[model samples]
Target: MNIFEMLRIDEGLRLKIYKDTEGYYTIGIGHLLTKSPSLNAAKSELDKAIGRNTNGVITKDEAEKLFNQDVDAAVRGILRNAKLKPVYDSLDAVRRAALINMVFQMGETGVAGFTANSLRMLQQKRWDEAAVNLAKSRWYNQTPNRAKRVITTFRTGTWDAYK
Candidate 1:
């Protein structure tokens, strides 16, 4: 990664002033500088940026683009820490995406302990058992429906799941 490119990414061309992830007073591209400004101070900067005092906000596209970048890094980390890569790779892209989403929401440590048995099942290619093991755990309760979806992806050649 080029340092210059990294700078561009980190500073995503702040088209306007808006709050950052922690709701800090930020303007232009990942808080190009200190986001520590008080709310009013941020508002003042935003007002200055756009020529009026007002409570404007970050645009949706900007938010999603930033979010996707974060998710990509996080998902890659989950795979990079590959004592579990076998299980991740064995699944289809959809299932892989599902697992990535789970890891993102649950955090790597959050799913680490729970995956042992399921990993073994996956390695053995016991799709049903793997799915069953997944459902019989803490993750399922958060929304078993999600379990259903991902599990189906793992199971029966997934055209769909958790429907």
Candidate 2:
């Protein structure tokens, strides 16, 4: 599966305002709206996207647009990260997509953490070790199923989760 297809399954399609597992208000397939300090600003932005402020709703097209932009940002962030970019550039397309998915969920900083042995292993092209190390992380603990899928994708360099 492609990156978009994998993310669509992982993030899910939500066209309305809803609280995520961490209680942050989100919309449009995991697009975070609470990044803005004030709820009013966030809501206003959401309203503008959906063309109204009343129902806190989004259209399918708008959601797709937001997802594409967010995914692009994630990809760019991974490629811009000094530590990650080199490893990212060295990987195959499927492994690259796994990194982008990781950045999509945790941001580039989270992947390049203080004890970032996983990325170190990846940089060394030890795919299994990298996958195992990532599976041992708090990120994996937070979302075991998704982490499992992503780890498998990284290790095997295949779309195993969707396939």
Candidate 3:
């Protein structure tokens, strides 16, 4: 699904607002939706929040700005786990957004890193390998049925998959 779809903002105006608020960065549901000029800077802040790197750490106040429930907390917890960086970095735009949606739903490190083999498979455009790689991760184990649905659509490009 598209980022807008994943975020459940179907209307054009909402999408535009999200874009405006997020600026060059990728923003999820409720994180103040502010603007930024640098994608790298925004990513770094997110990385810090998710604990991908230890250069900085987001405070509880920051966390509260983005999340309000156990699920959101769980998502943040998984994001800080640091095991899924490779997979998160390897994806192209559409796939990246899909993976981000997965992370947003399941937590970042909740899913295993996509293997180098998977990266090669996707790079080679081998649908079977790509699908297998996606399935081999923890997401399948944690949420089999839903993972399958997304993976199938991701691999086959049945939905309006972008980039």
Top candidate on lDDT is: 2
Candidate 2, overall lDDT?
A: 0.82
Q: Tens-digit lDDT track for model 2 on 74-151? A: 988877788888888888889888888888887777877823688778878898788778877888888899889999
Clashes of 1: 3
- As a whole number from 0 to 100, the lDDT of residue 97 in candidate 3 is 53
Q: 75-163 in candidate 3: lDDT tens per residue?
A: 45545655554444555666655555565554443444553566466646686778888888766786576577667655874553322
Q: Which pairs clash in the backbone of model 2? A: none
Worst ten in a row by lDDT for model 2: 49-58
Which wins on lDDT, candidate 1 or candidate 2?
2
List TM-score per model, in order.
Answer: 0.59, 0.89, 0.42
Two-way TM-score contest, 1 vs 2, winner = 2
The per-prediction tally of clashing pairs is 3, 0, 0
Q: lDDT for each of the candidates? A: 0.60, 0.82, 0.51
lDDT of model 3, residue 44: 70
lDDT score, candidate 1: 0.60
**Pairs that clash in candidate 3:** none
RMSD of each: 9.7, 2.2, 13.1
Q: Order of all candidates by TM-score, from best down to worst? A: 2, 1, 3
